[PDB]
Amino acid sequence: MEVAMVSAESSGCNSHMPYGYAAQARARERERLAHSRAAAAAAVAAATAAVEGTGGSGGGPHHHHQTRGAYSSHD
């Protein structure tokens, strides 16, 4: 849909009404639907471990094969 480019301006610069959040009144009308996303708990659903945190690698080697007997009594 070809169209001409519009540009809100008048004279060199005798009116540059910087309408910032002022044009945020539109969000106020959309925020009404942002009331349903209250109980979202999604982006966090995935995140936040299952309250888990316990480690400790290891097995437990049991001494095997003792030193030489030596000194044998039999007299």
Side-chain angles (χ1 to χ4, degrees), residues 24-38:
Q24 208 113 91
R26 210 131 178 176
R28 216 166 184 198
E29 266 184 84
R30 265 250 127 191
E31 277 222 80
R32 227 73 157 286
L33 234 298
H35 251 209
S36 181
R37 222 88 94 62

Side-chain angles (χ1 to χ4, degrees), residues 1-73:
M1 204 132 223
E2 80 217 325
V3 173
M5 276 258 207
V6 202
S7 311
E9 212 183 80
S10 50
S11 245
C13 188
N14 247 28
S15 262
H16 234 36
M17 232 104 76
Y19 225 59
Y21 73 77
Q24 208 113 91
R26 210 131 178 176
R28 216 166 184 198
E29 266 184 84
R30 265 250 127 191
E31 277 222 80
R32 227 73 157 286
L33 234 298
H35 251 209
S36 181
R37 222 88 94 62
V44 136
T48 286
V51 61
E52 189 132 273
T54 158
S57 70
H62 73 277
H63 222 250
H64 179 284
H65 262 201
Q66 66 253 12
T67 293
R68 267 191 256 86
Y71 162 52
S72 257
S73 70

